[PDB]
């Protein structure tokens, strides 16, 4: 349910990552395809080799979507309604996959901005990822 402090905590860590979208979204796709190989099944068409340029590019587009829901955090569904149709309806992604993606993202922010990631920002960032997950899977429920 994002409280006022959650919203702020999220904004807070996104300022430190708003500057490196492409290196951060690529790294998160790479750990996702490496720790959870079953997610590679959704990108049959991409080159999935470390540093492929399709990973960098998609990486960059995955975190701008994030930044954009940070920005409209008050109505994440409304700001992301075209992505919800793509993933639920067109792509049909299984919901479990969003938790794999969300976790590889926390893992990038702890490796790179540890101190930003306290236990309470940790909790705000998780409810956020989870809100995005739910909106992107919403034409399922």
């Amino acid at each position: 349910v994002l409280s006022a402090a959650d919203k702020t905590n999220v904004k807070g860590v996104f300022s430190k990552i708003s500057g490196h979208a492409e290196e951060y979204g690529a790294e998160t796709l790479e750990r996702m395809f490496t720790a959870y190989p079953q997610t590679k099944t959704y990108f049959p068409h991409f080159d999935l080799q470390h540093g492929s340029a399709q990973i960098k590019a998609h990486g960059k587009k995955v975190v701008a979507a994030l930044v954009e829901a940070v920005n409209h955090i008050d109505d994440i569904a409304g700001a992301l309604s075209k992505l919800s149709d793509l993933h639920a309806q067109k792509l049909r992604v299984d919901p479990v996959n969003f938790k794999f993606l969300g976790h590889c993202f926390l893992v990038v922010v702890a490796i790179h901005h540890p101190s930003a990631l306290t236990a309470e920002v940790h909790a705000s960032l998780d409810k956020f990822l989870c809100a995005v997950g739910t909106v992107l899977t919403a034409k399922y429920r």
């Binding site: 720790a35 893992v107 990631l117 236990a119």
Partner: protein, 146 residues
Amino acid sequence: VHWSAEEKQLITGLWGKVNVADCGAEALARLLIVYPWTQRFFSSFGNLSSPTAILGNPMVRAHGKKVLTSFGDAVKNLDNIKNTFAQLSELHCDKLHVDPENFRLLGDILIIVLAAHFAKEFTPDCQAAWQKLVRVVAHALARKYH
């Protein structure tokens, strides 16, 4: 599960640098702050009223030290994982009635914490091996759930 010799190398190399006390305390404390219903099982720990109180409660620190020490016994016996956690399975399953999905939330928190302590040394291949370890540990604990 099969362990490659390099997985075993990535688990052992890393483990030796771990501060068990601090990593265990941090991981238990984050389990209780991030997933608040888990606080129900540690009603006996006293004050878990705030993240700040959760962070400095001495029983959370002590207990954290002890859960990470169990991870170590797994690290040492990667092939006798079943026997190692067999008594723990009965305590968590039979006595505490913890659902196996919180076993998974806790190993995921461990990966985040070791990532924050190791930074770039925690490579995606290192991530992967550790993900498998927490998954096999979560699985050996859910086993008396038969």
